[PDB]
C-alpha cells in the first residue's frame, strides 16, 4: 500500500525460516507429498513470490519503494542448507553474522568479508 | 559438521600428515650428517677450550 501510494516502506520478515516450517506443516497436513528435508516442492516459490514484491517504483507509478530485510537462521553456520540457499539466491545482498566474530568482540558480527550488496556504489551518499 | 565440511577437513589433515612425514625423513638425514660432522668438531672445540679450564 505504501509503495503504491508514493510513500516509502521498510518490511522486516523475522524469520522466514519459520514461515517455511509453518508452510511445511500445512502442506504435510493437507497430504501433499513432501520434498527435500520434508519441505514441499513449492518452498522456493513461497519466498520468491514474497520477496519479489519489494520493488522501487519509477516516478510514473508514484515513485514509492518497499525495502525488505528478511531474516534467516542457519544451523551452526551451515549456510549451505536448503532454505538459506534458496533465500540467498532470491535476495540482492546479504549480511553474514558469525558467532566466532560475536564472541571475539566484533559486534555487530557482520562478516564484512562475505557480506555483499549488488547496488553497492549506487544508494550511497557521496561523503560515505 | 556436514559431509562436505568433514571431507575437506579430512583431506587437509591427510596432506598435513604426508608433509610432516616427509619432513621427518629429511630432518633425520640431515641429523645423521650433522652428527658425523660433529664428532671432529667436538674434539676440535674441546681442545680449543682446554687452556682456560687448565689455567
Amino acid at each position: 500500500y505504501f509503495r503504491d501510494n508514493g510513500k516509502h516502506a521498510l518490511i522486516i520478515y523475522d524469520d522466514l525460516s519459520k514461515q517455511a516450517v509453518a508452510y511445511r506443516q500445512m502442506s504435510l497436513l493437507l497430504r501433499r507429498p513432501p520434498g527435500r528435508e520434508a519441505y514441499p516442492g513449492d518452498v522456493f516459490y513461497l519466498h520468491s513470490r514474497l520477496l519479489e514484491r519489494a520493488a522501487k517504483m519509477n516516478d510514473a507509478f508514484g515513485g514509492g519503494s518497499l525495502t525488505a530485510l528478511p531474516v534467516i537462521e542457519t544451523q551452526a553456520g551451515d549456510v549451505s542448507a536448503y532454505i538459506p540457499t534458496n533465500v540467498i539466491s532470491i535476495t540482492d545482498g546479504q549480511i553474514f553474522l558469525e558467532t566466532e566474530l560475536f564472541y571475539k568482540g566484533i559486534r555487530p558480527a557482520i562478516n564484512v568479508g562475505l557480506s555483499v550488496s549488488r547496488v553497492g556504489s549506487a544508494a550511497q551518499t557521496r561523503a560515505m | 559438521a556436514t559431509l562436505k565440511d568433514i571431507t575437506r577437513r579430512l583431506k587437509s589433515i591427510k596432506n598435513i600428515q604426508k608433509i610432516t612425514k616427509s619432513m621427518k625423513m629429511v630432518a633425520a638425514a640431515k641429523y645423521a650428517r650433522a652428527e658425523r660432522e660433529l664428532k671432529p668438531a667436538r674434539v676440535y672445540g674441546v681442545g680449543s677450550l682446554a687452556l682456560y679450564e687448565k689455567a
Partner: protein
C-alpha cells in the same frame, strides 16, 4: 576416501588462513624490495 593437492587451503580452517598469511607477508616484502629496485633503475636510467 583420498586426499588431493591444494586441500589445506580448500578446507579454509586455521591452517588455510595461516598459510595464506605466511604467503602474503613474504610476497609483500619481496614486492617492496622489487619496487625499490625499480625506482632505483628508473632514476639511474633517466640520463
Amino acid at each position: 576416501v583420498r586426499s588431493s593437492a591444494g586441500a589445506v587451503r580448500d578446507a579454509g580452517g586455521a591452517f588455510g588462513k595461516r598459510e595464506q598469511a605466511e604467503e602474503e607477508r613474504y610476497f609483500r616484502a619481496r614486492a617492496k624490495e622489487q619496487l625499490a629496485a625499480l625506482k632505483k633503475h628508473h632514476e639511474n636510467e633517466i640520463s
